[PDB]
Amino acid sequence: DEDCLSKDIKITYQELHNCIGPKIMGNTCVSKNELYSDLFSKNLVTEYDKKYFEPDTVNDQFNKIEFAQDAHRMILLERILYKTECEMLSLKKNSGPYNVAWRTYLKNHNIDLCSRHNYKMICQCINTHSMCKNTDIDYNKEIETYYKSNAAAYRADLNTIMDTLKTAFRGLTKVLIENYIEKDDSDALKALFSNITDSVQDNYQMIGILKFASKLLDINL
Ligand SMILES: *[C@@H]1O[C@H](CO)[C@@H](O[C@@H]2O[C@H](CO)[C@@H](O)[C@H](O)[C@H]2NC(C)=O)[C@H](O)[C@H]1NC(C)=O
Ligand SMILES: [Cl-]
Ligand SMILES: [Cl-]
């Protein structure tokens, strides 16, 4: 698994799936100077990169990634953010202010499916933080029946879920999501959601949200 900083200038959006925060992040948040010495000693950054390791707020790092016009720059800034910003580590778990952020944003303006069908697993996952393991399983295809009869609620709920995911995974993940959403690339979106799933297996509710998101993409209208 070659390092995202090792590879070439021409990078596909598909290869960038290896470089997203959830995947490169571990269980630690080192200082930026320690990450710089670490990557430098691996011949992955140079002194010309040192400016990218200076302190900055997390929102400004988000914007520097999400407006980046160079792929190597986007990869490096994502790596720095998710290796050095301690709050991001909460994404591998259930609790933390960063999880309550997207969690309350999602429950707040809920999805229309849950108004008339509060008993569906996705609705229990969103509202009561429970039953998140089975959110993609549609027993007797009741969820799919609902959406193809209420396309307004389908587009509203799909947009709400996409916005939830883009809020939870600022940076490269959000760039990729917006890219595929504009290209109408549902296969790529399901592949990205699958890749994220592999990296956040201990984020119960977020696993539920990703499963449900992939299910919604199967519902093709
Ligand atoms: C992320 O997930 C995607 C899809 O699950 C992976 O891409 C697939 O890899 C298999 C490996 O045999 C291929 O047969 C498929 O053609 C690939 N694409 C799809 C759409 O299934 C990918 O390997 C995962 N990891 C990344 C991108 O780092
Ligand atoms: Cl469960
Ligand atoms: Cl879990």
Author numbering: 482 to 702
Question: What do the authors of the reporting publication say about this deposited model?
Answer:
The OBV M segment encodes two glycoproteins, Gn and Gc, derived from a single polyprotein precursor, with Gn encoded upstream of Gc. Compared with other bunyaviruses, OBV Gn is relatively small, with an ectodomain of about 200 amino acids (aa), whereas Gc, with an ectodomain of ca. 900 aa long, is about twice the size of its Gc counterparts from other bunyaviruses. Our structural analysis has revealed that this region is composed of two domains: a 27 -kDa α-helical head domain and a stalk that is divided into two identically folded 19 -kDa tandem β-sandwiches. Furthermore, the head domain is well exposed to the environment and is a major target of the humoral adaptive immune system of the OBV mammalian hosts, indicating that the trigonal pyramid of the spike shields the functionally more critical membrane fusion core machinery from the host’s antibody response.
